[PDB]
Design a protein around this ligand. Structure first.
Ligand SMILES: *CCC(=O)N1CC[C@@H](Oc2n[nH]c3ncc(-c4cn(-c5c(F)ccc(NS(=O)(=O)c6cccc(-c7ccccc7)c6)c5F)nn4)cc23)C1
Length: 291
């Protein structure tokens, strides 16, 4: 627990909404470092356990703000924004298969660390493209991985999170590390299609569809089978039938040695104007499925 004086910071802008859980971008004046600061309504001293986590694909702890009433956590700031903002911009048109693979390896490796490599097993429960950020060198960093255990005020809206929640998370059921595997496959699908998952729908409809009808996000027919089948394993209703992140890492290795995949995938990636109608059709069939 490094301590960071409130006056040691210069606050720039707030994401979230001024509330507890809202993230400020800020300059750490003692250190001349650009930082993120999360507004907490206090700090749990027992939360030291998480201050020892360190991995190039998770956001880096810097220190804590302990000046009542100002309580905050300070971390690195990733220069290039959230994965979400990037995927749903026209910048994502520059993504080739080597890009997808690198970024999906980045997330899978950060998750493998939290699940199996750190001082304490961390199951994230809220992994999603808005919780992954892009450092200056394209390296991805998982955010908010300690939220589900300590500061449960940061998350829950929760209607905006159903497309990434495993079914068992939706039902408040027994939960295993493979709930993060389901959320990852949604992140993968986001990278491949560059769409907002279940765009336009009601959270409760998606919650319902995922849980009762085993509805999953449309996989375009022209998506390479290797990607399609990886998505499928990551989306098994039966959490015990989903891969671990060690297996995902090993799967991405095989895919990246497949000489045929790069043309197949890059073709698919750059023909979005053909197969975007497939996803958009399923969206109206699902919207009309409540009217
Ligand atoms: C407003 C629109 C929007 O969403 N965006 C606009 C731009 C983009 O924001 C960006 N761009 N780059 C970014 N880089 C980082 C973040 C960011 C950082 N955090 C943040 C915190 F401020 C605090 C904690 C966490 N995660 S954590 O709670 O799991 C954690 C990590 C490490 C240690 C600890 C800890 C230590 C001791 C005791 C308890 C806990 C906790 C965190 F992610 N959020 N966003 C945003 C960026 C998106």
């Amino acid at each position: 627990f490094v301590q960071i004086k409130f006056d040691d910071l210069q606050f720039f802008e707030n994401c979230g909404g001024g509330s507890f859980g809202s993230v400020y971008r800020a300059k750490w004046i003692s250190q001349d470092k650009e930082v993120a600061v999360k507004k907490l309504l206090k700090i749990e001293k027992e939360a030291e356990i998480l201050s020892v986590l360190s991995h190039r694909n998770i956001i880096q702890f810097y220190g804590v703000i302990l000046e009542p009433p100002n309580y905050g956590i300070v971390t690195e700031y990733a220069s290039l924004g959230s994965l979400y903002d990037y995927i749903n911009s026209n910048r994502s048109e520059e993504m080739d298969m080597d890009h997808i693979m690198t970024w999906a390896t980045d997330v899978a490796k950060g998750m493998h660390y939290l699940h199996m490599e750190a001082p304490v097993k961390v199951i994230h429960r809220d992994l999603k493209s808005r919780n992954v950020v892009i450092a200056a060198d394209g390296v991805l960093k998982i955010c908010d991985f300690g939220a589900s255990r300590f500061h449960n005020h940061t998350t829950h809206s929760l209607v905006g999170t159903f497309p990434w929640m495993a079914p068992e998370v939706i039902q408040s059921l027994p939960v295993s590390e493979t709930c993060d595997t389901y959320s990852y496959g949604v992140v993968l699908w986001e990278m491949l299609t560059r769409e907002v998952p279940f765009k336009g729908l009601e959270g409760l409809q998606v919650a319902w569809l995922v849980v009762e009808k085993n509805e999953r996000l449309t996989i375009p027919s022209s998506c390479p089978r290797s990607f399609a089948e990886l998505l499928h394993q990551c989306w098994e209703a039966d959490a015990k039938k989903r891969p671990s992140f060690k297996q995902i890492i090993s799967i991405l290795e095989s895919m990246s040695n497949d000489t045929s995949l790069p043309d197949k995938c890059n073709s698919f990636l750059h023909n979005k104007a053909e197969w975007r109608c497939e996803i958009e059709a399923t969206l109206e069939r699902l919207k009309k499925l409540e009217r």
